[PDB]
Amino acid sequence: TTRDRILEEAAKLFTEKGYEATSVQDLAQALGLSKAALYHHFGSKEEILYEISLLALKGLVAAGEKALEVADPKEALRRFMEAHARYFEENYPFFVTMLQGIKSLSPENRLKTIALRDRHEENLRAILRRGVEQGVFREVDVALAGRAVLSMLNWMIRWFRPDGPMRAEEVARAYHDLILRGLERGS
Amino acid sequence: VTTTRDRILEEAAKLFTEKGYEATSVQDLAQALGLSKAALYHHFGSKEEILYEISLLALKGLVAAGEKALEVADPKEALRRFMEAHARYFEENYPFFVTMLQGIKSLSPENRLKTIALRDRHEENLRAILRRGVEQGVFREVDVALAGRAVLSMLNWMIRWFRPDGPMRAEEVARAYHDLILRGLERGS
């Protein structure tokens, strides 16, 4: 019914069948729509791919921006990482799809996708920079620190198992402990 | 020495990086390399075998890179060498890595097997370095699999944002990551 549910179903199908191997015909059948209705309401597989990517990235950006406010930089960083991982898990299929079709978006939509990813990274940098300035974090290359944190969260799409024992959030909480305190002992 | 066999693999790796593995035909490679399709089949038997050998070349070189680190006494220095050797190798053989990452689903089961076994081996060598650090009390008590995954994530994610074009040195980035993961973000001493 709602465009949102359709996008969700499409994302699951793309995740199971693969975006390239999924035909418009497949999408219509799985969604309970005639091909005609799908073309009229969505135009193409690319438009469906774009809206899925948009929901995922906008939801992620919002999930992280909600931690940018936390007073304690250490706590802000932890909430950012945990929110990111939780959102990733709850919307797993949207993230997998988005990875199987970036090169298939129109030019302007690819720019929009990059802008959103840049925004999420900027919010993380703001948290780190604030922590540095108010002496909560050691002076480090913020740009690299953020890339490091994002690498840990984003690379999860390559190994995390949705029906596994651990919740992405718990994984993220351990990554936070690791990145905050480091590996050395003593101090 | 670069023989016809080697040129085919390096050139294929670049073409796959430029066009994508799936969108590149045996016909495409043959013409790009100035050889008949017959010559390609004679040396590799199939397109999949070419992708397989490119992956092996990248993974074997990577695995060797991390074995050097296992020989470093000081766990902290062993971790740094592992990370830098990984990043340096990645950058010098960039096209092979771009080919391997995307092609995974395309390999035959047994090929994917020897390949993943090399990736797992690399992850296991890193874990051994971290575990020794925890055992010798050099590193605090941390989940070894998770710490190893954290490090590999930093190094492998580079395959998506590192620009061979830019001036930044993959190994220097790896050094900054080592400092970060070893000491942490918190201001402490």
Coordinates of C-alpha atoms in Angstrom, one line a residue:
Chain A
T1 CA 0.0 0.0 0.0
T2 CA 2.2 2.9 1.2
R3 CA 5.3 3.7 -0.9
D4 CA 7.4 2.9 2.2
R5 CA 6.2 -0.8 2.4
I6 CA 6.8 -1.3 -1.3
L7 CA 10.4 0.1 -1.0
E8 CA 11.0 -2.2 2.0
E9 CA 9.8 -5.3 0.1
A10 CA 11.8 -4.3 -2.9
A11 CA 14.9 -3.9 -0.7
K12 CA 14.4 -7.4 0.7
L13 CA 14.0 -8.9 -2.7
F14 CA 17.1 -7.2 -4.0
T15 CA 19.0 -8.5 -0.9
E16 CA 17.9 -12.1 -1.6
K17 CA 17.9 -12.2 -5.4
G18 CA 20.5 -9.5 -6.1
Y19 CA 19.6 -6.1 -7.6
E20 CA 20.9 -6.9 -11.1
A21 CA 19.3 -10.2 -11.3
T22 CA 15.9 -8.8 -10.1
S23 CA 13.6 -7.9 -13.0
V24 CA 10.8 -5.4 -13.0
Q25 CA 8.6 -8.4 -13.5
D26 CA 9.9 -10.0 -10.3
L27 CA 9.3 -6.8 -8.4
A28 CA 5.7 -6.5 -9.6
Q29 CA 4.9 -10.1 -8.7
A30 CA 6.5 -10.0 -5.3
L31 CA 4.9 -6.7 -4.5
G32 CA 1.4 -7.8 -5.7
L33 CA 1.4 -5.2 -8.5
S34 CA 1.0 -5.4 -12.2
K35 CA 4.0 -4.3 -14.2
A36 CA 1.9 -1.4 -15.5
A37 CA 1.2 -0.1 -12.0
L38 CA 4.9 -0.4 -11.0
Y39 CA 6.0 1.6 -14.0
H40 CA 3.3 4.2 -13.4
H41 CA 4.1 4.6 -9.7
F42 CA 7.9 4.1 -9.8
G43 CA 9.1 4.5 -13.4
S44 CA 12.0 2.2 -13.2
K45 CA 14.3 0.0 -11.0
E46 CA 16.7 2.9 -10.7
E47 CA 14.0 5.1 -9.1
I48 CA 13.2 2.3 -6.6
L49 CA 17.0 1.9 -5.9
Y50 CA 17.3 5.7 -5.3
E51 CA 14.4 6.0 -2.8
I52 CA 15.7 3.0 -0.9
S53 CA 19.2 4.6 -0.7
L54 CA 17.6 7.9 0.3
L55 CA 15.6 6.4 3.1
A56 CA 18.6 4.5 4.4
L57 CA 21.0 7.4 4.3
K58 CA 18.6 10.0 5.6
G59 CA 17.6 7.7 8.4
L60 CA 21.3 7.1 9.2
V61 CA 22.1 10.8 9.1
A62 CA 19.2 11.5 11.5
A63 CA 20.2 8.6 13.7
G64 CA 23.7 10.1 14.1
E65 CA 22.7 13.8 14.3
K66 CA 20.8 12.9 17.5
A67 CA 24.1 12.2 19.2
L68 CA 25.8 15.3 18.0
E69 CA 23.9 17.1 20.9
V70 CA 25.1 14.9 23.8
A71 CA 27.2 17.1 26.2
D72 CA 29.8 14.6 27.0
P73 CA 31.9 13.9 23.8
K74 CA 32.7 10.4 24.9
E75 CA 29.0 9.6 25.4
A76 CA 28.1 11.4 22.1
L77 CA 30.6 9.2 20.2
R78 CA 29.2 6.1 21.8
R79 CA 25.6 7.0 21.0
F80 CA 26.6 7.9 17.4
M81 CA 28.2 4.5 16.9
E82 CA 25.4 2.6 18.6
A83 CA 22.7 4.4 16.7
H84 CA 24.4 3.9 13.4
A85 CA 24.8 0.1 14.0
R86 CA 21.2 -0.2 15.3
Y87 CA 19.8 1.6 12.4
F88 CA 21.9 -0.5 10.1
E89 CA 20.6 -3.7 11.6
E90 CA 16.9 -2.7 11.6
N91 CA 17.2 -1.6 8.0
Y92 CA 19.7 -4.2 6.9
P93 CA 18.1 -4.9 3.4
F94 CA 18.2 -1.1 2.5
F95 CA 21.9 -1.1 3.2
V96 CA 22.7 -4.2 1.2
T97 CA 20.7 -2.9 -1.8
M98 CA 22.3 0.5 -1.7
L99 CA 25.7 -1.3 -2.0
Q100 CA 24.6 -3.3 -5.0
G101 CA 23.5 -0.3 -7.1
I102 CA 25.4 2.9 -6.5
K103 CA 26.8 2.9 -10.0
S104 CA 23.2 2.6 -11.4
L105 CA 21.8 5.9 -9.9
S106 CA 21.5 9.0 -12.1
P107 CA 24.3 11.6 -11.7
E108 CA 22.3 14.0 -9.5
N109 CA 21.1 11.2 -7.3
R110 CA 24.7 10.0 -6.8
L111 CA 25.7 13.5 -5.7
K112 CA 22.8 13.5 -3.2
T113 CA 24.0 10.1 -1.9
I114 CA 27.5 11.4 -1.5
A115 CA 26.2 14.6 0.2
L116 CA 24.4 12.5 2.8
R117 CA 27.3 10.2 3.5
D118 CA 29.5 13.4 3.8
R119 CA 27.0 14.9 6.2
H120 CA 27.0 11.8 8.5
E121 CA 30.9 11.9 8.5
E122 CA 30.8 15.6 9.2
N123 CA 28.5 15.1 12.3
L124 CA 31.0 12.4 13.6
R125 CA 33.9 14.9 13.0
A126 CA 32.0 17.5 15.0
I127 CA 31.7 15.2 17.9
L128 CA 35.4 14.3 17.8
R129 CA 36.6 17.9 17.3
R130 CA 34.5 18.9 20.3
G131 CA 36.0 16.2 22.4
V132 CA 39.5 17.3 21.5
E133 CA 38.9 20.9 22.2
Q134 CA 37.4 20.4 25.6
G135 CA 40.2 18.0 26.5
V136 CA 38.1 14.8 26.6
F137 CA 40.0 13.3 23.6
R138 CA 43.7 13.3 22.8
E139 CA 44.8 15.5 19.9
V140 CA 44.5 13.3 16.8
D141 CA 43.8 13.8 13.2
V142 CA 40.0 14.2 13.4
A143 CA 39.5 13.4 9.7
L144 CA 41.4 10.1 10.1
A145 CA 39.7 9.3 13.4
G146 CA 36.3 9.7 11.9
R147 CA 37.3 7.6 8.8
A148 CA 38.5 5.0 11.2
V149 CA 35.3 4.9 13.2
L150 CA 33.2 4.8 10.0
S151 CA 35.3 2.1 8.6
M152 CA 34.5 -0.1 11.6
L153 CA 30.8 0.6 11.3
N154 CA 30.5 0.5 7.5
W155 CA 32.6 -2.6 7.0
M156 CA 30.1 -4.4 9.2
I157 CA 27.9 -4.9 6.1
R158 CA 30.6 -7.3 4.9
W159 CA 30.3 -9.7 7.8
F160 CA 27.5 -9.0 10.2
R161 CA 24.9 -11.8 10.3
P162 CA 21.3 -10.5 10.9
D163 CA 20.3 -13.7 12.7
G164 CA 23.6 -14.0 14.5
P165 CA 24.0 -14.1 18.3
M166 CA 25.3 -10.6 18.6
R167 CA 23.3 -7.4 17.9
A168 CA 25.1 -4.8 15.8
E169 CA 24.7 -2.4 18.7
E170 CA 26.7 -4.6 21.1
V171 CA 29.4 -4.9 18.4
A172 CA 29.4 -1.1 18.1
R173 CA 29.7 -0.7 21.9
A174 CA 32.8 -3.0 21.9
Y175 CA 34.3 -1.0 19.0
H176 CA 33.7 2.2 21.0
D177 CA 35.5 0.8 24.0
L178 CA 38.3 -0.3 21.7
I179 CA 38.7 3.0 19.9
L180 CA 38.3 5.1 23.0
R181 CA 40.8 3.3 25.3
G182 CA 43.1 1.8 22.7
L183 CA 44.8 -1.6 23.1
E184 CA 47.7 -0.7 25.4
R185 CA 47.6 -1.6 29.1
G186 CA 48.1 0.5 32.2
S187 CA 46.7 3.8 30.9
Chain B
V1 CA 60.2 -10.8 -15.3
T2 CA 56.8 -10.1 -17.0
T3 CA 55.7 -12.9 -19.4
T4 CA 52.6 -13.1 -21.6
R5 CA 50.9 -14.9 -18.8
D6 CA 51.7 -12.2 -16.2
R7 CA 50.7 -9.3 -18.6
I8 CA 47.4 -11.0 -19.1
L9 CA 46.7 -11.0 -15.4
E10 CA 47.8 -7.4 -14.6
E11 CA 46.1 -6.1 -17.7
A12 CA 42.9 -8.0 -16.9
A13 CA 43.0 -6.7 -13.4
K14 CA 43.1 -3.1 -14.7
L15 CA 40.4 -3.7 -17.2
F16 CA 38.1 -5.3 -14.6
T17 CA 38.8 -2.3 -12.3
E18 CA 37.9 0.1 -15.2
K19 CA 34.9 -1.8 -16.6
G20 CA 33.8 -4.2 -13.8
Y21 CA 34.3 -8.0 -13.9
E22 CA 30.9 -8.9 -15.0
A23 CA 30.7 -6.3 -17.8
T24 CA 34.1 -7.5 -19.3
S25 CA 33.9 -10.3 -21.9
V26 CA 36.7 -12.7 -22.8
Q27 CA 36.4 -11.0 -26.2
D28 CA 37.1 -7.6 -24.5
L29 CA 40.2 -8.9 -22.8
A30 CA 41.5 -10.6 -25.9
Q31 CA 41.3 -7.4 -28.0
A32 CA 42.6 -5.2 -25.2
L33 CA 45.6 -7.5 -24.8
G34 CA 46.1 -8.0 -28.6
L35 CA 45.6 -11.7 -28.4
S36 CA 43.0 -14.1 -29.8
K37 CA 40.4 -15.6 -27.4
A38 CA 42.2 -18.9 -28.0
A39 CA 45.4 -17.6 -26.6
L40 CA 43.5 -16.5 -23.4
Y41 CA 41.8 -19.8 -23.0
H42 CA 45.0 -21.7 -23.5
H43 CA 46.7 -19.9 -20.6
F44 CA 43.8 -19.8 -18.2
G45 CA 41.0 -22.1 -19.5
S46 CA 38.3 -19.7 -18.4
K47 CA 37.5 -16.1 -17.4
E48 CA 36.7 -17.3 -13.9
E49 CA 40.2 -18.8 -13.6
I50 CA 41.7 -15.3 -14.5
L51 CA 39.6 -13.7 -11.8
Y52 CA 40.7 -16.5 -9.5
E53 CA 44.4 -16.1 -10.1
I54 CA 44.2 -12.3 -9.8
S55 CA 42.5 -12.9 -6.4
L56 CA 45.1 -15.4 -5.3
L57 CA 48.0 -13.1 -6.4
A58 CA 46.5 -10.3 -4.2
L59 CA 45.7 -12.5 -1.2
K60 CA 49.0 -14.5 -1.2
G61 CA 51.0 -11.3 -1.4
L62 CA 48.9 -10.0 1.5
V63 CA 49.2 -13.1 3.6
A64 CA 53.0 -13.0 3.2
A65 CA 52.9 -9.4 4.2
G66 CA 51.3 -10.2 7.5
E67 CA 53.6 -13.2 8.2
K68 CA 56.6 -10.8 8.4
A69 CA 54.9 -9.2 11.4
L70 CA 54.5 -12.4 13.3
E71 CA 58.3 -12.4 13.6
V72 CA 58.5 -9.1 15.4
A73 CA 59.0 -9.6 19.2
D74 CA 57.3 -6.5 20.5
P75 CA 53.6 -7.0 20.0
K76 CA 53.1 -3.2 19.5
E77 CA 55.7 -3.1 16.7
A78 CA 54.4 -6.3 15.2
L79 CA 50.9 -4.8 14.9
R80 CA 52.2 -1.7 13.3
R81 CA 54.3 -3.6 10.7
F82 CA 51.3 -5.8 9.9
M83 CA 49.1 -2.8 9.3
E84 CA 51.7 -0.9 7.2
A85 CA 52.7 -3.9 5.1
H86 CA 49.0 -4.6 4.5
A87 CA 48.3 -1.0 3.3
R88 CA 51.5 -0.7 1.3
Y89 CA 50.8 -4.0 -0.5
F90 CA 47.2 -2.9 -1.1
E91 CA 48.4 0.4 -2.7
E92 CA 51.1 -1.2 -5.0
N93 CA 48.6 -3.8 -6.2
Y94 CA 45.5 -1.6 -6.2
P95 CA 43.8 -3.0 -9.3
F96 CA 44.1 -6.6 -8.1
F97 CA 42.3 -5.7 -4.9
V98 CA 39.5 -3.8 -6.7
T99 CA 39.1 -6.9 -8.8
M100 CA 39.1 -9.4 -6.0
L101 CA 36.6 -7.6 -3.7
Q102 CA 33.9 -7.3 -6.3
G103 CA 34.4 -10.7 -7.9
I104 CA 33.9 -12.9 -4.8
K105 CA 30.4 -14.1 -5.8
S106 CA 31.7 -14.9 -9.3
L107 CA 34.3 -17.6 -8.3
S108 CA 33.5 -21.3 -8.4
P109 CA 32.9 -22.8 -4.9
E110 CA 36.3 -24.4 -4.7
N111 CA 38.1 -21.3 -5.9
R112 CA 36.2 -19.2 -3.5
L113 CA 37.4 -21.7 -0.9
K114 CA 41.1 -21.3 -1.4
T115 CA 40.6 -17.6 -1.6
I116 CA 38.6 -17.2 1.6
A117 CA 41.0 -19.6 3.3
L118 CA 43.8 -17.0 2.5
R119 CA 41.7 -14.2 3.8
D120 CA 40.9 -16.2 7.0
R121 CA 44.6 -17.0 7.4
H122 CA 45.5 -13.3 7.2
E123 CA 42.8 -12.5 9.9
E124 CA 44.2 -15.4 12.0
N125 CA 47.8 -14.0 11.9
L126 CA 46.5 -10.7 13.1
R127 CA 44.6 -12.4 15.9
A128 CA 47.8 -14.2 16.9
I129 CA 49.7 -10.9 17.2
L130 CA 46.9 -9.4 19.3
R131 CA 46.5 -12.5 21.4
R132 CA 50.2 -12.5 22.2
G133 CA 49.9 -8.8 23.2
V134 CA 47.1 -9.7 25.6
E135 CA 49.0 -12.7 26.9
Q136 CA 52.3 -10.8 27.5
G137 CA 50.2 -8.2 29.2
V138 CA 51.3 -5.6 26.6
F139 CA 47.7 -5.0 25.5
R140 CA 44.8 -4.9 27.9
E141 CA 42.2 -7.7 27.9
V142 CA 40.2 -7.2 24.7
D143 CA 38.1 -9.4 22.5
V144 CA 40.8 -10.6 20.0
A145 CA 38.4 -11.4 17.2
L146 CA 36.7 -8.0 17.5
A147 CA 40.0 -6.1 17.8
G148 CA 41.2 -8.0 14.7
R149 CA 38.0 -7.2 12.9
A150 CA 38.4 -3.5 13.9
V151 CA 41.9 -3.3 12.4
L152 CA 41.0 -5.2 9.2
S153 CA 38.0 -2.9 8.8
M154 CA 40.2 0.1 8.9
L155 CA 42.7 -1.3 6.4
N156 CA 40.2 -3.0 4.0
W157 CA 37.6 -0.2 3.9
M158 CA 40.5 1.9 2.3
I159 CA 39.6 0.0 -0.9
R160 CA 36.6 2.3 -1.1
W161 CA 38.0 5.7 -0.3
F162 CA 41.7 5.6 -1.0
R163 CA 42.6 7.5 -4.1
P164 CA 45.7 6.2 -5.9
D165 CA 45.4 9.6 -7.6
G166 CA 45.8 11.6 -4.4
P167 CA 49.2 12.1 -2.8
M168 CA 48.3 10.6 0.6
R169 CA 50.4 7.5 1.3
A170 CA 48.3 4.4 2.3
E171 CA 51.1 3.3 4.6
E172 CA 51.2 6.7 6.4
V173 CA 47.4 6.5 6.9
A174 CA 48.0 3.0 8.3
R175 CA 50.5 4.4 10.7
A176 CA 48.1 7.0 12.0
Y177 CA 45.5 4.2 12.4
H178 CA 48.0 2.2 14.4
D179 CA 48.7 5.1 16.7
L180 CA 44.9 5.6 17.1
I181 CA 44.1 1.9 17.8
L182 CA 47.1 1.4 20.1
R183 CA 46.6 4.5 22.3
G184 CA 43.0 5.3 21.9
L185 CA 41.1 8.6 21.6
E186 CA 40.8 9.4 25.2
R187 CA 43.3 11.9 26.7
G188 CA 45.1 9.9 29.4
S189 CA 48.9 10.2 29.6

